Amino acid sequence: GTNFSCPVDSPPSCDTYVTYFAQSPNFLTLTSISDLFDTSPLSIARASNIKDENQNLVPGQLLLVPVTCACSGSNSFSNISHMIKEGESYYYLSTTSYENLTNWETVQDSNPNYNPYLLPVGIKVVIPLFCKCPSNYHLNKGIEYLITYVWHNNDNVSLVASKFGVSTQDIISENNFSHQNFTAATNFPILIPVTQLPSLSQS
């Protein structure tokens, strides 16, 4: 499907964004998400068109979190050093906290020396988010960012496309959605290509 391999021709590191949605158990503050992602709340608010940094986020509200993304071998990642809180697994952390922007596998692959369930509260575990950075061909098109977005079984391209202000075809071809198996109930990361940061709806 979508290849998350380091472009051979374009720089190894870059700035893009990953998509995160407000979650009603705990992540309904900017503070929640900034602590989850190690960035300032204003950077998120600026990237998400939020004009008041103190307003609560409504459940499911779309947000763009700026991340800096680099090469770790032949694949692109953006690592977040997350400190362990009480009762957190790799699986929990990566399917609810980080909202499937990373799978348990790659996490415990770049976090050796550890027991995936005996995590002592207060240890640094690096959470490699998925991200790609513009190939040379991306940049010659005018693409400024490949935003990470977690495709679920429920999304349809027209809604997401109008949300990010792109064509359906842009999404479909960037992710080779023309022979891609949505049968699998899996969630998988994809890349929205955008010529500029989009002007997200107000709530």
Ligand X SMILES: *[C@@H]1O[C@H](CO)[C@@H](O)[C@H](O)[C@H]1NC(C)=O
Residues at the interface with ligand X (CB under 6 A): 156, 158-159
Q: Smallest distance, Å, CB 155 to ligand X? A: 9
- Distance between CA 135 and CA 102 in Å, rounded? 22
CB of 156 to ligand X, least distance (A): 4
Comparison of 140 and 154: residue with beta carbon closer to ligand X: 154
Report in angstroms how near the CB of residue 113 gets to ligand X at its nearest.
46
Whichever of 156 and 199 has its CB closer to ligand X, that residue is 156
Residue placing its CB nearer to ligand X in the complex, 8 or 185: 185
CA distances to 23, 32, 57, 136, 194 from 20, in Å: 9, 12, 12, 27, 17
Residue 198 has phi, psi (to 5 degrees) of -85, 160
Pull the structure tokens for residue 55: 């307003």
Position closest to ligand X via CB: 158
Smallest gap from residue 168 Cβ to ligand X (A): 9
Distance CA 67, CA 193 (A): 15
